[PDB]
Amino acid sequence: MELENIVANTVLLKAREKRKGKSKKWKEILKFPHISQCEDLRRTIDRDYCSLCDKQPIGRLLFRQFCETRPGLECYIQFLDSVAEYEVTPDEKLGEKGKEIMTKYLTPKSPVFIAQVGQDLVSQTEEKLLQKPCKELFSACAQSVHEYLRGEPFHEYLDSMFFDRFLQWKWLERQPVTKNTFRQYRVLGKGGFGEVCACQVRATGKMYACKRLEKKRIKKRKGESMALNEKQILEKVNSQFVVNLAYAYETKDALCLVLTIMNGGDLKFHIYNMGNPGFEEERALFYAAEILCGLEDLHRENTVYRNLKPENILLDDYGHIRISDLGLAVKIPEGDLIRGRVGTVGYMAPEVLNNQRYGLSPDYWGLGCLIYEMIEGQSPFRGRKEKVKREEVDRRVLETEEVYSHKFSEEAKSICKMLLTKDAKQRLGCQEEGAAEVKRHPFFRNMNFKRLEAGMLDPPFVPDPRAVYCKDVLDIEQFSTVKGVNLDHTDDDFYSKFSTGSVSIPWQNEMIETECFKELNVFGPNGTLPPDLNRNHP
Numbered sequence: 001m002e003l004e005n006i007v008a009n010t011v012l013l014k015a016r017e018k019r020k021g022k023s024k025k026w027k028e029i030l031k032f033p034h035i036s037q038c039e040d041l042r043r044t045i046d047r048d049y050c051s052l053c054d055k056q057p058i059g060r061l062l063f064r065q066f067c068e069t070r071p072g073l074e075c076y077i078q079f080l081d082s083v084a085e086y087e088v089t090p091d092e093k094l095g096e097k098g099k100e101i102m103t104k105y106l107t108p109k110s111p112v113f114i115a116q117v118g119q120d121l122v123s124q125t126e127e128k129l130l131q132k133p134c135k136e137l138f139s140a141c142a143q144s145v146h147e148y149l150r151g152e153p154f155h156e157y158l159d160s161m162f163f164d165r166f167l168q169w170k171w172l173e174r175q176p177v178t179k180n181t182f183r184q185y186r187v188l189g190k191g192g193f194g195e196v197c198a199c200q201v202r203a204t205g206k207m208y209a210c211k212r213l214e215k216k217r218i219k220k221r222k223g224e225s226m227a228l229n230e231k232q233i234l235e236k237v238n239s240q241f242v243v244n245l246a247y248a249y250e251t252k253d254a255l256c257l258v259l260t261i262m263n264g265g266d267l268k269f270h271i272y273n274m275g276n277p278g279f280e281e282e283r284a285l286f287y288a289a290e291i292l293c294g295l296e297d298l299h300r301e302n303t304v305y306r307n308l309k310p311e312n313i314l315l316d317d318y319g320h321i322r323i324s325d326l327g328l329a330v331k332i333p334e335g336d337l338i339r340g341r342v343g344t345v346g347y348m349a350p351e352v353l354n355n356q357r358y359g360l361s362p363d364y365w366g367l368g369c370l371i372y373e374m375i376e377g378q379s380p381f382r383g384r385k386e387k388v389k390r391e392e393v394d395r396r397v398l399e400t401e402e403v404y405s406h407k408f409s410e411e412a413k414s415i416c417k418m419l420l421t422k423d424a425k426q427r428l429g430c431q432e433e434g435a436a437e438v439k440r441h442p443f444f445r446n447m448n449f450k451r452l453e454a455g456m457l458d459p460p461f462v463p464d465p466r467a468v469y470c471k472d473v474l475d476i477e478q479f480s481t482v483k484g485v486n487l488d489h490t491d492d493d494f495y496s497k498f499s500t501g502s503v504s505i506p507w508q509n510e511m512i513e514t515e516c517f518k519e520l521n522v523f524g525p526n527g528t529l530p531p532d533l534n535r536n537h538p
């Protein structure tokens with residue numbers, strides 16, 4: 001056993017767990033400025049209700065805490081809250097939970113009577129509940145409320161100390177990000193132009209994965225657009241099954257993408273480097289469903305992936321999964337196909353192997369590639385440790401068809417072949433239906449996709465918190481360190497465009513999640529102005 005491996009792993013594990021790993025001077029690092037400093041932010045901030053009072057979490061929570069001051073608004077907040085409950089109550093008890101809300105917000109004498117909805121809608125929605133319940137029953141009601149809260153109540157929040165306080169938080173969000181903000185841990189993987197590392201924000205202690213993009217490697221491979229595209233794309237997609245981007249900065253030697261951290265290890269590892277090859281069909285189904293949901297969301301944004309292999313699918317702490325390394329994805333101009341001989345060997349669709357124009361098709365080819373591999377324990381066109389020169393694998397994918405065993409259930413066998421069809425025209429999901437056509441296949445039977453996309457299905461396999469499901473640090477491949485390249489000032493523009501600092505909404509979640517927002521967001525006694533917000537005197 002190499003100590004270089006033991007140490008690398010035990011260090012990471014301590015961080016993963018006093019102070020939840022925070023730095024010692026976090027209260028000073030994240031100290032609010034005096035409100036007088038936020039005049040540029042007071043002007044530049046765009047005054048949108050959903051953004052400032054909903055989409056941006058801290059804005060949302062400060063508005064709610066502000067609504068708790070006016071009794072006439074705390075009810076609307078509790079109403080939309082109750083609606084949230086009704087919208088996640090089971091179809092079985094939808095009618096009942098529909099009943100408590102109704103007797104609570106709609107009678108003129110209800111204790112939490114809200115009058116701003118409209119006496120017509122209460123009756124329209126009342127008959128709909130007497131008829132039959134639907135989770136989208138109060139959709140119009142909650143909309144009618146949002147029409148009112150966005151009016152007078154919204155501008156009242158903007159005038160109070162709570163929105164003033166939100167400016168202070170946004171001042172922190174704007175703060176520059178540097179290597180200092182984080183501490184680097186063991187390497188988690190090689191890929192693309194750099195390495196993926198565990199790191200931890202010193203101030204907050206939140207764990208992330210730092211996908212490094214080594215500058216010299218970008219210049220040497222003309223992959224400038226490929227690196228940049230990955231960054232924006234990671235930003236544009238906002239999905240439960242895709243790594244979300246939290247920071248993006250520059251260093252003396254690399255550009256960096258700070259992404260959600262996936263401590264369960266990648267699926268390539270769970271298939272070959274743990275227990276018997278592959279895992280039970282139960283496990284394959286759950287993960288395959290989530291991969292589907294991720295691909296449908298990626299395609300909703302009109303974006304292909306082209307890089308689907310187990311090594312780029314990761315497992316989180318609870319057993320859910322997300323897609324990684326979106327550096328091979330491109331957004332498609334609508335009504336056009338692209339020619340690109342890119343991808344990894346044996347995970348390329350026949351169109352991509354023939355340098356033929358394609359659209360969203362090669363993604364469903366990959367979905368089949370993974371499902372077969374999870375259950376069969378090997379690529380559908382390549383062995384386990386099989387040494388094959390690429391030319392043949394290429395041939396096999398185009399000429400030869402896959403082979404199934406008794407391990408495949410009737411449904412598992414079927415969904416593979418329909419996804420592993422050489423003709424892109426007759427490929428499952430590649431029809432106009434899209435990912436819907438796949439959501440049906442009996443393979444995903446008793447797989448309530450609507451309930452999975454919520455997250456109410458427990459993963460079958462739960463990674464143990466005290467396990468690093470990754471190759472040991474000394475077993476991670478390295479590059480042939482690029483040297484003799486010299487970075488010119490011509491690239492400082494791209495470095496600037498790439499390094500956009502923190503991502504607004506994610507940063508706020510970190511402050512909320514790390515309880516930094518909870519501990520810091522306090523006010524004077526009896527709900528009075530603290531000193532940082534009083535511009536009259538100290």
Ligand SMILES: NC(=O)c1cn([C@@H]2O[C@H](CO)[C@@H](O)[C@H]2O)c2ncnc(N)c12
Pocket residue numbers: 188189190191196209211243259260261262263265266311312314324325470
């Ligand atoms: N941003 C990424 O792409 C990630 C890559 N790895 C690991 O590092 C390897 C190199 O990409 C992968 O196969 C995973 O084992 C990751 N592990 C956790 N979270 C992540 N976001 C990644």
Ligand SMILES: [K+]
Pocket residue numbers: 270271272274275276277278279
């Ligand atoms: K296994």
